[PDB]
DNA sequence: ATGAACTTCAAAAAAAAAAA
């Protein structure tokens, strides 16, 4: 199902007119297309480049498929009419001649044996007269932009004769048919059966085709080539007898999705997501749709793309799915492709890890809270960072919190450590440090990494007995009383006592609570002083002694307890109510 | 009530734009705005464009922010959109919700940015509040007909042989223009 | 949340100060500077400093208590606390530093829980 | 028919396609299912035949990259030195599997004298209830043990209760017909699961 | 060759180290993603048995053939020779490039992914090196550092299940001497395979079950459930093997089983 | 090439400072979060041994695979310009270079070294392997907010009145860290770890905190090095049977430990005389 | 540079004042909480030694890497405007900058300095490493609430004319802090820290409290500086087997101390003379 | 001749909230 779900959208995108390589071809990224006249005579070396900031090498021309050269005598293979600045010009940037001239001795051979088998084309007779020139090819090096194709190793030049103007020599409706004939005769006399993917006879394809976009080089996604990965003496592709017509389909299915908008990194794991076979598009809804509705394979991938993007957008919505999205989360090994994810499941089922991420991360917010309901990871991790989210450690943090969030894994200790660092370093617990600590501690509980404690809740737990959480609440009420006593404070007992009330409660809370009677005295509403003192009595009723030192477990609680109680105090009528029910 | 727009008059008076006539006039205006295209279709988003303006909370914000009978920034676009998606049709409802929930936040995506799928699913409480406002005092129950059978006409009066998908966005923006205009 | 038999001198002094201020704040409830507002800072740290003066000051609050039996109520728990206080410590230990605030608010809760003192007195 | 109930913490019925980067077949392969039933009992008279797998725990995956070795062992070179022949095969393993393989068997051409189907049937029956085996059954890979049992009818809850995923063309049971003694020249027959209605029935060739 | 079926419950532990890191995730100890319990792929155990037998034997009949470059530096007549002069080929089996079953020698000793008893808490210890290796991107002016990463399990009592099959020993010639070497390995291999990544590991018990039958007179599951390993009564988080009750249960196996408590 | 196998219990302690701060946690001392027990990585004590051998030995045959300007390939390639430049046929040139460092770099003899980096120079296991030392009791990391009365950069706030960069100086008020160590004969054979190179390591463990001091770690001391020398290059006894043999418990009734005086290191030299030797080097 | 390694016990007390306020804890003195014993960061005494050297030396080769308007990158960039502007080849440009910052700044030559910051000046460890100063007995931080008859910005000015901002003055009614310190020779070689700079440091330790007085310090003194000068660059004896020679206890019958006359500082120079000197510089 | 050693292959890949 890993590949029959790729074959079964090649057969969908090839039938949704989405423009996928048709049965013999490949959307190869040809950077430095060659222009020739009708009888040779190199005209121009156009570069079909200029895309995303790393100038990806060429407009994807859907040219005859890359033949997977890959060998010591790699020169013999010679892709049909597009290959290489070493195959087209015999120019070796770093490979040396006789490893580029023998390439050109075979690329010219390939073109010519095409020309004999495909005459009166004026496109291949042109290039076959351009590949029997040795001078116009020399003129290719003396081109205006040749110096920029020599810069890109493995440049793929291809032969657009002039007077076709978009259509390559390998695009004419004879080379197009030749490839549709050279992938229907030569790749049909091979090992007769039987398909792994489709199950049909469909002659077996040894050498699956170089799935591009995963690795540093197009690597054969399914490729058993070492002395023992071969199971039954099957030798490299008969270990997995996938037909040529099916091998091509899923290879060019990955190739487009790793080159399309389907590709997106879940985290450090480039993933191709495509909608499964959509339901028959119930009649009423299909009444308005013309055709009617078509199963565009990559249609609602956004639902899943904007699910993992929701972890950074903070725009997570609990989804109701039943629209199943294939999500093949491949990743490079070295030059194999490691399927790290495979999910035919719905986006609702995929969300169960981000939902648990944004439910373990749920934290109290008052009214008109400037904080998002589900707080974006970059803005969430920005509460761990020095002052702006780029220095949060790209290996135990932003790159691992995401893996701990995308997968409902345990948030690393490096959050308590980092979130606590910032709690007592910014001298305040931003929503985002309280929320992130709530997520850490909830998952530490759920993993049995935080044994005695019970999972935190959104709200303040006017309970919880936790010698760190209740002192966090105590600090929250103490600082609320101070900020209620002195509205404009320059050094709240946060900014002055937090670093040691969080981590060392006897050092401080024995002296915060001498400031406390004075703060209560200064409350202009003495009844408000009574209410706040009542709740600090309630808070401190759960406390039997300020601990000498708060474990890393509880300084997270302190921060969570602080934020819980401080958003309880800044609730509409919470303290007035809770006081009035006593 | 309900106070669609609270204009502090130049004479230090306050005039109230009745949401009744605000929605009525917007729908009538973006019924001529669309020709054979969405004449009675864009109005059904004109009727609904500020349904969330019926919010009991927003009728406490538009007063607070515009100084009518003496700061929260209460969303109101999404409520009309959710009302549409539940009442007309999963197709027409979302069609109309693009227009409605975008009418101030800008036209929204379904998934990626400012996603409607998120806002509608989160509009349930907001729609409940705004529809409670709508039913609470005034606005006869057949003020929002949302007659899908009639609304099916100008859709099919324009989409002869069904709705082209690759250019259904052009209404979603042209009829959006009718609403926002 | 009150260990009436804690014996932690900081905690018993916190309890004692809580009842002392309870009496002061029942002696005259309209009070600008209760002993929390004027004495707590050292009662929590230097119990010998105040707690001597806090009990010069205590019988007069017990007199000023309007409900003459309420004075017995609160004096009884002062004695209940002071059984656990063999001496007002010169300087409260740091553990005891914090436990004094613990005691203040534990015993303050115990006093402002409705029937607790009037009940617990009647089991003596 | 035997309703043996393979189960194990992990399992890798490695898809032929994703062999170097092992991705387990979502359920027990009828080859791996059968060879398990040869691990408990086999003889070149019994020829096992899986009649119906039944998934008993949901298809749950855990990726495990093991530093596998790249090359076979050989008489020629008398050692590997793994750090020279290292490979890192990922393994999308099947965590917490269970499968009640409803399997029976037939008698081969070389059934011998004591060709009693009942003899081998009761032999396997005693082996499975007692727990005996020639080989601790491999859930696709020997690194994964089959904590089996010989159920009579049904003693575990199959999770794919309503009609569930069709895993497509899985390796059925590699064809050792052209092979000489000890499976030299084989081929792979493969099967539409048929679906997984709640426990997949397999197809006898 | 041995004539008994051995199903053993190895119980090693890691006290401050990385038992078996994950190439998935850098080098962090293989956790079970859903339950947090650590995994130690049997090939790691199969390695330290291999390593031990390579350290100790240093002779013919006991080579390893999958040997470490960093620890020591007709058709059924060479496959028997491989199952003769290579202890690993006998013990753990082989895939001989020439063979009968397209290569395999299965070898008696099957092994289980050593799942930890309780959720290990992989401690991502970001370590530093006061030196860069290459002419780094930032092997710059101020100092050469290559801030690194070294994980530990603060303790994990990993439980492995091995299944020595006397049926395979007959093909491989895995004699009772070789199997005694195997127990010596499991017990005495975390004393010899020490490292920086692997911290301190200790074979905290190798509870073999010898079966009077070749075929094996028990379900291996039932035997392993006789070796009940639990966190102790008051142990909140495990940190040493004396935080585990390894209660073996020999009460009912006594029919024809032998619980050789070879390591505990 | 030592001929015995050693299993030592090193017990050092930290008085006031970061025994080994966690770069993941500012510079918080590595705490095992579950138990609060401190951790001092393998590499920390290996580095402190390295520093001790950069201090006291300072010659060829005891280089250290070294300090700041330590482009490690500059040493790894330095191997390949040796007696093994071209006659050692890369296959075994790697091993020859690996042996060159196991002749030259005391760190690479004692501990290992991943040297496969530059011109691949082998990959040594290291006869001496320390384990992450856990403090016997939870370290009560104090996390002092120090102040600096001088800003470093032209800060966003390096403003008018004062320039200040407060910062954090985490300290362990006391932690008795118990490193376990394994000096395996088998890898002492491939690296040439000599009995001399082993007495150097014993000296290093005993004296390497007296010499590796800092503002960060303050005072650390080696509080005892109980070495179990086994008669065979195998193990006479299981290592942990010998490490539980050295049991360190907080003193009878100290609720929080302030010094070694609040710990009790009781060794059990009663039954190891099987053939083993407990040689007590610090305790 | 120095050719002996020193381990000094620097007993300094505070009589009525805040020896080192914990910014994490209001300003109340740093305290080892679970033992109540006070703390004075190593950076605090390094600061007062810096203040002393900035006070007395007033000359180049003894600058201090300095007071408030002390943007450190400014001094570091001064290092890169030297003989090593270009001539030192960025790799060792930072090392030449270290040698400079060590030459000029006695702070850097004596204590270290993290100067990797601006035009990177390297990273000096600093031969002199004071530890944290844990008071012998629990400091009974008094936290004297004080008053001011004045306020600050007319936002906290009273709604009546009576302005006052009482505030708090934490004082240790007495604490005999004990700072272990280590003059490491190996890093004296790095910084050029000489016996002249070391005698400056000893004067600084003895006289660093006579000069750094605050309303906060009240009265701090240097009750003793017992310097263990080892014969070797290495340590003749383990550092803590020396520091246990300076046993400071509260005297016979003091419930808790109130002056140095309440502490007996017993110095045990009986057998340290193995090869090694104890010089009672301060006491 | 089989299997390690080696030689070619190919030339990455990049994001991320408002609020009507
Ligand atoms: Mg509007």
What is the topology, as strand order, of the major beta sheet of chain A?
6-7-8-9
Q: Span from first to last CA of chain E?
A: 26 Å
Largest sheet of chain A: 4 strands, antiparallel
Helix content of chain E: 10-25%
| Oligomeric nature of the chains | part of a larger assembly
PDB class: dna binding protein
Keywords: CRISPR, type I-C, Cascade, Anti-CRISPR, DNA binding protein
Entry title: Exploiting Activation and Inactivation Mechanisms in Type I-C CRISPR-Cas3 for Genome Editing Applications
Chain A: CRISPR-associated protein, Csd1 family
What does this structure look like?
The structure is cut from a larger assembly and holds one copy of chain A (582 residues), one copy of chain B (181 residues), one copy of chain C (124 residues), one copy of chain D (205 residues) and three copies of chain E. Chain A has 582 residues and is an alpha+beta fold. Chain A has 20 helices and nine strands. The two termini of chain A are 62 Å apart. In chain D, strand 7 and strand 8 form a beta hairpin. The longest helix of chain D is centred in the middle third of the chain and has 14 residues, at 117-130. Chain E has six helices and ten strands, in the order βαααβββββααβαβββ. Chain E starts with a strand and ends with a strand. Chains E and F meet through strand 4 and strand 7 of E and helix 1, strand 6, helix 5 and helix 7 of F. The complex binds magnesium ion. Residues 49-50, 103-104 of chain B line the site of magnesium ion. Chain A binds one DNA strand of 20 nucleotides through strand 6, helix 9 and helix 11. Chain A: This is CRISPR-associated protein, Csd1 family. Chain A: It comes from Neisseria lactamica ATCC 23970.
């Amino acid at each position: 199902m890993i590949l029959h779900a790729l074959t079964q959208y090649y057969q969908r995108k090839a039938e949704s007119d989405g423009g996928i390589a048709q049965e013999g071809f490949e959307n190869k990224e040809i950077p430095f297309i060659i222009v020739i006249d009708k009888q040779g005579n190199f005209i121009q070396l156009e570069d079909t480049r200029e895309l995303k900031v790393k100038k990806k090498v060429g407009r994807t021309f859907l040219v005859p498929k890359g033949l997977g050269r890959s060998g010591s005598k790699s020169y013999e293979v010679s892709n049909l009419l597009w290959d290489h600045y070493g195959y087209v010009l015999a120019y070796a940037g770093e490979k040396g001649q006789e490893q580029a001239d023998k390439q050109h001795a075979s690329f010219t051979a390939k073109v010519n044996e095409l020309k004999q088998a495909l005459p009166d084309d004026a496109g291949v007779t042109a290039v076959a007269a351009f590949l029997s020139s040795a001078e116009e090819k020399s003129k290719v090096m003396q081109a205006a932009n040749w110096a920029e194709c020599a810069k890109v190793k493995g440049c793929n030049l291809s032969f657009r004769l002039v007077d076709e103007a978009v259509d390559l020599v390998c695009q004419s409706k004879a080379v197009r048919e030749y490839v549709s004939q050279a992938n229907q005769t030569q790749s049909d006399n091979a090992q007769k059966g039987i398909c792994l993917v489709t199950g049909k006879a469909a002659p077996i394809a040894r050498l699956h085709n170089a799935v591009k976009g995963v690795n540093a080089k197009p690597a054969p996604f399914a490729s058993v080539n070492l002395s023992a990965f071969e199971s039954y003496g099957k030798e490299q592709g008969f270990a997995f007898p996938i037909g040529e017509q099916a091998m091509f389909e899923y290879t060019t299915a990955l190739n487009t999705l790793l080159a399309g908008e389907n590709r997106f990194r879940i985290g450090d794991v480039t993933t191709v997501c495509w909608g499964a076979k959509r339901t028959p598009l119930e009649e009423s809804l299909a009444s308005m749709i013309n055709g009617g509705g078509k199963d565009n394979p990559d249609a609602h991938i956004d639902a899943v793309k904007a699910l993992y993007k929701s972890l950074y957008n903070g725009q997570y919505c609990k989804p109701d799915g039943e629209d199943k999205f294939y999500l093949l989360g491949l990743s490079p090994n070295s030059a194999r492709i490691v399927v790290r994810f495979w999910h035919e499941t719905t986006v609702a089922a995929l969300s169960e890890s981000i939902a648990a991420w944004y439910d373990d991360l749920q934290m109290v917010r008052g009214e008109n809270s400037p904080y998002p309901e589900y707080m974006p990871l970059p803005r969430l991790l920005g509460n761990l960072v020095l002052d702006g989210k780029m220095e949060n450690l790209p290996s135990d943090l932003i790159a691992q919190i995401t893996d701990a969030a995308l997968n409902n894994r345990v948030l690393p200790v490096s959050l308590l450590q980092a979130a606590l660092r910032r709690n007592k370093a910014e001298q305040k617990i931003t929503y985002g440090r309280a929320s992130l600590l709530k997520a850490y501690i909830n998952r530490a509980i759920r993993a049995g990494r935080l044994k005695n404690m019970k999972e935190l809740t959104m709200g303040l737990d006017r309970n919880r007995q936790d010698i760190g959480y209740v002192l966090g609440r105590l600090f929250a009420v103490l600082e609320k009383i101070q900020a209620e006593a002195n509205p404009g404070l320059n050094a709240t007992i946060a900014d002055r006592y937090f670093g040691s009330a969080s981590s060392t409660p006897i050092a401080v809370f024995g002296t915060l609570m001498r400031l406390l009677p004075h703060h209560l005295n200064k409350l202009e509403f003495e009844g408000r002083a009574v209410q706040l003192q009542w709740e600090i009595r309630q808070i401190l009723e759960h406390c039997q002694r300020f601990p000498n030192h708060l474990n890393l477990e509880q300084q997270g609680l302190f921060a969570i307890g602080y934020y819980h109680e401080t958003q309880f105090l800044f609730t509409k009528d919470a303290l007035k109510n809770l006081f009035n029910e006593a | 009530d309900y106070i669609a727009h609270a204009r502090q008059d130049s004479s230090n008076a306050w005039h109230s734009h009745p949401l009744q006539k605000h929605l009525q006039k917007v729908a009538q205006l973006a019924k001529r705005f669309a020709g054979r295209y969405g004449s009675l279709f864009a109005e059904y988003a004109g009727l609904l464009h500020d349904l969330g303006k019926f919010q009991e909370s927003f009728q406490k914000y538009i007063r607070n922010a515009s100084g009518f009978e003496k700061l929260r920034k209460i969303p109101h676009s999404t409520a009309g959109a959710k009302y549409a998606v539940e009442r007309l049709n999963p197709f027409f409802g979302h069609l109309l919700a693009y227009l409605i929930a975008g009418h101030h936040a800008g036209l929204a995506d379904w998934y990626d940015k400012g996603s409607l799928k998120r806002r509608l699913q989160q509009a349930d409480d907001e729609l409940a509040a705004s529809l409670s406002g709508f039913v609470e005092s005034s606005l006869p129950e057949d003020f929002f007909p949302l007659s899908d059978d009639d609304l099916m006409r100008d859709f099919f009066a324009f989409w002869e042989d069904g709705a082209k998908l690759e250019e259904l966005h052009i209404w979603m923006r042209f009829l959006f223009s009718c609403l926002v205009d | 949340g009150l260990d009436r038999n804690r014996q932690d001198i900081g905690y018993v002094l916190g309890r004692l100060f809580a009842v002392l201020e309870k009496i002061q704040a029942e002696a005259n409830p309209g009070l600008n500077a209760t002993i929390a507002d004027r004495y707590f800072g050292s009662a929590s740290s230097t119990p010998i400093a105040v707690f001597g003066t806090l009990m010069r000051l205590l019988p007069h609050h017990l007199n000023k208590l309007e409900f003459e039996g309420r004075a017995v109520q609160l004096q009884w728990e002062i004695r209940q606390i002071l059984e656990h206080c063999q001496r007002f410590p010169n300087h409260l230990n740091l553990e005891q530093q914090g436990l004094f605030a613990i005691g203040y608010y534990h015993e303050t809760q115990f006093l402002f829980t409705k029937d607790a003192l009037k009940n617990l007195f009647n089991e003596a | 028919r035997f309703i043996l109930e393979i189960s194990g913490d992990l399992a890798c019925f490695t898809r032929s396609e994703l062999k170097v980067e092992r991705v387990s077949y979502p359920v027990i392969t009828p080859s791996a299912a059968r060879n398990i039933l040869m691990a408990i009992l086999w003889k070149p008279a019994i020829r096992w035949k899986v009649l119906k797998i039944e998934i008993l725990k949901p298809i749950q995956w855990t990726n495990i990259r093991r530093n596998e070795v790249g090359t076979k062992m050989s008489e020629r070179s008398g050692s590997l030195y793994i750090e020279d022949n290292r490979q890192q095969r990922a393994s999308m393993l099947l965590k917490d599997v269970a499968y009640r393989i409803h399997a029976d068997f037939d008698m081969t051409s070389e059934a011998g004298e004591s060709d009693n189907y009942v003899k081998f049937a009761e032999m396997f029956k005693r082996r499975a209830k007692k727990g005996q085996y020639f080989h601790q059954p491999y859930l696709g890979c020997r690194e994964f043990p089959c904590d089996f049992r010989l159920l009579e009818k049904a003693e575990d809850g199959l999770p794919l209760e309503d009609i569930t995923q069709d895993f497509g063309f899985m390796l059925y049971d590699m064809d050792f017909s052209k092979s000489d003694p000890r499976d030299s020249n084989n081929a792979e027959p493969m099967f539409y699961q048929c679906k997984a209605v709640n426990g997949v029935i397999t197809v006898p060739p | 060759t041995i004539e008994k079926r051995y199903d053993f419950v190895f119980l090693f532990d890691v006290q401050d180290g990385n038992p078996n890191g994950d190439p998935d995730a850098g080098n962090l100890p293989r956790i079970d993603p859903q339950t947090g319990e650590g995994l130690v792929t049997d090939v790691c155990l199969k390695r330290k048995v291999r390593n031990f037998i390579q350290m100790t034997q240093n002779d013919e009949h006991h080579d390893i053939f999958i040997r470490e470059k960093g620890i020591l530096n007709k058709t059924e007549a060479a496959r028997q020779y491989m199952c003769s002069r290579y202890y690993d080929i006998r013990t753990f089996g082989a895939v001989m490039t020439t063979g009968k079953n397209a290569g395999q020698v299965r070898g008696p000793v099957q092994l289980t992914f050593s799942r930890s008893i309780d959720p290990i808490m992989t401690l991502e210890h970001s370590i530093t090196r006061m030196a860069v290796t290459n002419e780094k991107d930032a092997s710059e002016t101020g100092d050469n550092r290559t801030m690194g990463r070294k994980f530990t399990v603060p303790y994990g009592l990993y439980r492995c299940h091995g299944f020595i099959s006397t049926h395979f020993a007959k093909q491989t010639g895995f004699s009772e001497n070789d199997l005694e070497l195997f127990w010596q390995a499991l017990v005495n291999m975390f004393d010899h395979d020490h490292s920086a990544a692997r911290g301190q590991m200790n074979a905290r018990g190798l509870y073999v079950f010898e079966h009077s039958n070749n075929l094996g007179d028990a379900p291996a599951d039932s035997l392993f459930k006789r070796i009940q390993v639990v966190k102790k009564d008051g142990v909140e988080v495990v940190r040493s093997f004396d935080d585990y009750l390894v209660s073996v249960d020999d009460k009912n196996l006594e029919e024809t089983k032998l619980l050789r408590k070879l390591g505990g």
